[PDB]
Curated annotation (Swiss-Prot), chain A:
Encoding gene per record: RpL3
Organism: Drosophila melanogaster
Summary of the function given for this chain in its UniProt record: The L3 protein is a component of the large subunit of cytoplasmic ribosomes.
Domain of life according to the entry: Eukaryota
Homology family: Belongs to the universal ribosomal protein uL3 family.
Subcellular location: Cytoplasm
Transmembrane region(s): none
Protein name: Large ribosomal subunit protein uL3
From Swiss-Prot, chain C:
SUPFAM superfamilies xrefs: Translation proteins SH3-like domain
Protein name: Large ribosomal subunit protein eL14
Pfam families on file: Ribosomal_L14e (PF01929)
Record-stated family: Belongs to the eukaryotic ribosomal protein eL14 family.
Gene Ontology MF annotations: RNA binding; structural constituent of ribosome
Keywords assigned: Ribonucleoprotein, Ribosomal protein
UniProtKB/Swiss-Prot annotation, chain D:
Keyword Protease assigned: no
GO CC annotation: cytosolic large ribosomal subunit; cytosolic ribosome; ribosome
Gene Ontology molecular-function annotations: mRNA binding; structural constituent of ribosome
Organism classification: Eukaryota, Metazoa, Ecdysozoa, Arthropoda, Hexapoda
Source organism of the structure: Drosophila melanogaster
A Pfam match: Ribosomal_L13
Domain of life the protein comes from: Eukaryota
Coiled-coil segments: none
Name of the protein in question: Large ribosomal subunit protein uL13
Length: 103, 114, 159, 205, 78
RNA sequence: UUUAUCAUAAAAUAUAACUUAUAGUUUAUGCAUUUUAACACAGAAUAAAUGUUAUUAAUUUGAUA
RNA sequence: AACGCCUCUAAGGUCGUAUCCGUGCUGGACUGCAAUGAUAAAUAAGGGGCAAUUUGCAUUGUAUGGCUUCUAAACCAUUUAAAGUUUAUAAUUUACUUUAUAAACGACAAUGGAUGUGAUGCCAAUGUAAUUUGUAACAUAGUAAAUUGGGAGGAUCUUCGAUCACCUGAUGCCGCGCUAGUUACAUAUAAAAGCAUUAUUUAAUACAAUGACAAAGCCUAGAAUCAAUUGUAAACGACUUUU
């Protein structure tokens, strides 16, 4: 499950040429938060983690343009949450979608 | 042929599987002019009895089927059907011929009391 | 001691694997761990010995001395009346697929296995014979109580 | 399905001996076979555990010395302990006997449709027809755990998942037969119905 | 067992398979020719448990191992 | 051999009394009854089962030709 | 315990190594597996999916002599070659749990099978095969189906896995077509003269599967690489980056 808005710094792992492109990721499959979805799209996709899964890991950017490099293209990383009763882990990860976490 | 769509044809004992018991035919006439020699294909005279004649392909000279044969067919299948309904309807007596052998569970090709 | 089959004189045993297959013999004595004597007068088996792995045991003891000759086993075999109470033994009916389902000629089969469509076409339409929660009524049974009036009253349709 | 018998013969591995179930299956797979053996963590091995400990621990020290990666790859599942057998019993260096292990799928912990499809027992290879009293046996469940199989309690919890919903699909079916034995009552006056089958069975009435 | 495969001795077994060509007409009762058959005849018994040998017309190309041949039921003693 | 007849033996277990034992049983620690697979060669009687002699009934038996 | 007794052992439980096995760590079924994102050019026309596809041609795979079919509904919940299993019953109890009492089965014939283990089809014919055959009379039984919102429901390298089966709100009225039995009646079909017929066993019907064409609406409007740059990298490729 992805958050709907993502930084242009950090939709840049998904491209090997970004100047050249038309910037079309994640343009389609981020409309799932704007359709009905409450019976169909995403609340099912968060139901699935409460029941089947055992390990919930979370996906994070790094705001690398604060680092002043010539790089401008992010680093995506799966961090595992480790707090109990994975009913918690799906609500912790549903809170902190699109919101920063600092060291 | 009325029942099973099968005329008075002629088969070997090699191509046939005789079941256990009988059907009673105690007073059947078996109208003995149905000889083996009586029923060749008649014939291919190599052309139309004139001797040394012409031909085009795809002739139909072998299968009417015979008008006299349809009188012999309605004689037996009259008299056979008065018999075969009067049997005790067992496994193979009345509507009981009419289905297409392919066998089933717990039974045989090997070593049966067939 | 849950009183299993005992090899004891003369526990009545029905043989399989050897040439006395299908014969109800009587034990007379014990020769070995693995062999016994055997004597069934009424079932037609004279006094042999027999490999114990071949004969299987039934619930029928009968009393003789262990030194008995056949004539007094024969006296005892009829006196306790085995012959009538064995052909009703509760799975000696299940012997008789040997006399009925074994080879079941092809002057038997079709009739005996065409009625299984007769029986089943009257069984599947004996389904949705339903009580479980619907009851009542499970719409669209506005139309089907007319069909279900032919289960209850049944004059004439619904309703 | 349809084939030389079906397109599968599902065998439960529970309670069977590892090498008699192998040479039955490697013979049948060369007949044109299609087996699919499930529950491989349950195959019994003869001898006690410290007999088969030592023998699997000797087959893993056989590695190449020049470069160990080339040397015998020692697979540690239970289903690969058994698939290793059915390659000793198959001509696996031929294009005939390589299509004979490509009929063999072998699973350990009975998944995905081989949990509704009927699976059968091979009484020639059962333990309790073959192995005596007093004789200790093993299971390939604990052999693979003590030689490094990291998924033993994975599949034990997955078993209890499909053991648990088996009780939901039997209590669907235990009462449903109770409907049939009531549905059997209304047909005793069908026409002349049951007489033609009961006169050849009758032992189940 | 060997009394079982002693039934089939003498039966014209056939091995049936397919090929890309027709190359031939329907000459006797209608022939499409996509199906090839090598006719044979079962000869004797083989195993001690009911396998069987069969001499064929040509000789069975051995990528036919494990593929079905059809033992016929004709020519039949009863 | 086996079935069968004979005469005696001598009777080693099985039908065929009633002990005691055993627990479960009742009634007031015993009895009353119940299973004795505890079961007193505990007895009678029977099997003359077993023991002796002899003969055999479609004279019964296989293998070997 | 054997072996009236002792005994670390025969059955059973334990204590336990710098060893062994695993984790941690490095490589990754070279090119395994899962998740995911985008899905072209054009925007006139096209190209690309949806798709059973609806519309034909035409092939393969097949049940191949109408169906030598099968079903993709179960037989323990540590185990024990006598080992015990079911069944009611009474109590107990989430539970066929637990317990008692009583049964059956006597490791047979049988059960390794057809309980065809939600009870298979071997077909609606009321003449059934390499096509389908019609209509009344009588008896019981009495199905199968098609349109609308909320829930609970389902993931093991999948035969189609953001869908999904049941169930309630509720739309509605098939009242289209059920079937079994008894009896009557209405036709059509079917016969390849081969009378010691088989052959490179066709093939259908149907099932399913693509394939390609003119045929059929919908949906769709991205990238990678090279070249240039970088210097976290460098023999070369390759990797990290940038417009």
């Amino acid at each position: 499950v992805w958050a709907q808005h993502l930084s242009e710094e950090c939709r840049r792992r998904f491209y090997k040429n970004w100047y050249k492109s038309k910037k079309k990721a994640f343009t389609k499959a981020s409309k799932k938060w704007t359709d009905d979805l409450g019976k169909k799209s995403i609340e099912n996709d968060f139901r699935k983690m409460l029941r089947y899964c055992k390990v919930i890991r979370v996906i994070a950017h790094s705001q690398i343009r604060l680092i002043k490099q010539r790089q401008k293209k992010a680093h995506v990383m799966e961090i595992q949450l480790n707090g109990g009763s994975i009913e918690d882990k799906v609500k912790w990860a549903r809170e902190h979608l699109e919101k920063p976490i600092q060291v | 042929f009325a029942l099973n769509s099968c005329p008075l044809r002629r088969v070997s004992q090699r191509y046939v599987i005789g079941t256990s018991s009988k059907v009673d035919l105690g007073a059947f006439k078996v109208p003995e002019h149905l000889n083996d020699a009586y029923f060749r294909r008649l014939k291919a005279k190599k052309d139309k009895k004139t001797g040394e004649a012409d031909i085009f392909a795809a002739k139909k000279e072998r299968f009417v089927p015979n008008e006299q044969r349809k009188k012999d067919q309605k004689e037996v299948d009259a008299a056979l059907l008065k018999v075969i309904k009067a049997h005790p309807e067992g496994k193979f007596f009345a509507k009981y011929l009419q289905n297409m052998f392919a066998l089933h569970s717990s039974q045989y090709p090997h070593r049966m009391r067939f | 001691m849950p009183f299993e089959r005992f090899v004891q004189t003369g526990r009545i045993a029905k043989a399989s694997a050897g040439p006395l297959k299908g014969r109800l013999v009587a034990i007379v004595d014990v020769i070995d761990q693995n062999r016994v004597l055997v004597d069934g007068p009424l079932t037609g088996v004279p006094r042999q010995e027999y490999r114990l792995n071949n004969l299987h045991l039934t619930k029928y003891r009968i009393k003789f001395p262990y030194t008995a000759p056949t004539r007094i086993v024969r006296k005892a075999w009829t006196e306790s009346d085995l012959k009538a109470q064995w052909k009703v033994s509760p799975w000696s009916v299940k012997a008789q697929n040997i006399c009925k389902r074994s080879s079941l000629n092809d002057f038997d089969r079709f009739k005996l296995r065409y009625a299984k469509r007769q029986r089943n076409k009257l069984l599947t339409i004996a389904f949705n014979t339903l009580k479980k929660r619907t009851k009542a009524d499970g719409t669209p049974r506005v139309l089907k109580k007319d069909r279900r009036e032919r289960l209850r009253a049944e004059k004439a349709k619904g309703g | 399905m349809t084939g030389l018998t079906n397109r599968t013969v599902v065998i439960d591995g529970r309670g069977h001996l590892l090498g008699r179930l192998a040479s039955v299956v490697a013979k049948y797979l060369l007949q044109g076979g299609k087996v699919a053996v499930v529950r491989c963590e349950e195959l019994n091995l003869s001898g006690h555990f410290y007999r088969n400990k030592i023998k699997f621990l000797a087959y893993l020290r056989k590695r190449c010395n020049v470069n160990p990666a080339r040397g015998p790859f020692h697979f540690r599942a239970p289903s690969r302990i058994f698939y290793k057998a059915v390659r000793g019993m198959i001509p696996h260096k031929t294009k005939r006997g390589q299509a004979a292990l490509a009929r063999l799928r072998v699973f350990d912990g009975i998944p995905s449709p081989y949990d509704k499809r009927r699976r059968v027992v091979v009484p020639i290879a059962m333990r309790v027809l073959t192995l005596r009293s007093d004789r200790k046996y093993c299971q390939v469940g604990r052999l693979s755990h003590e030689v490094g199989w990291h998924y033993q309690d994975v599949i034990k919890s997955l078993e209890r998942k499909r053991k648990a919903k088996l009780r939901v699909t039997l209590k669907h079916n235990r009462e449903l037969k109770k409907l049939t034995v009531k549905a059997r009552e209304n047909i005793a006056k069908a026409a002349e119905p049951f007489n033609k089958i009961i006169k050849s069975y009758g032992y189940e009435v | 067992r060997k009394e079982h495969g002693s039934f089939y001795v003498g039966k014209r077994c056939v091995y049936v398979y397919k090929a890309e060509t027709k190359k031939c007409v329907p000459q006797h009762p209608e022939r499409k020719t996509r199906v090839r058959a090598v006719w044979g005849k079962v000869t004797r018994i083989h195993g001690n448990t009911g396998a069987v040998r069969a001499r064929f017309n040509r000789n069975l190309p051995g990528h036919a191992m494990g593929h079905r041949i059809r033992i016929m039921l004709y020519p039949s003693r009863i």
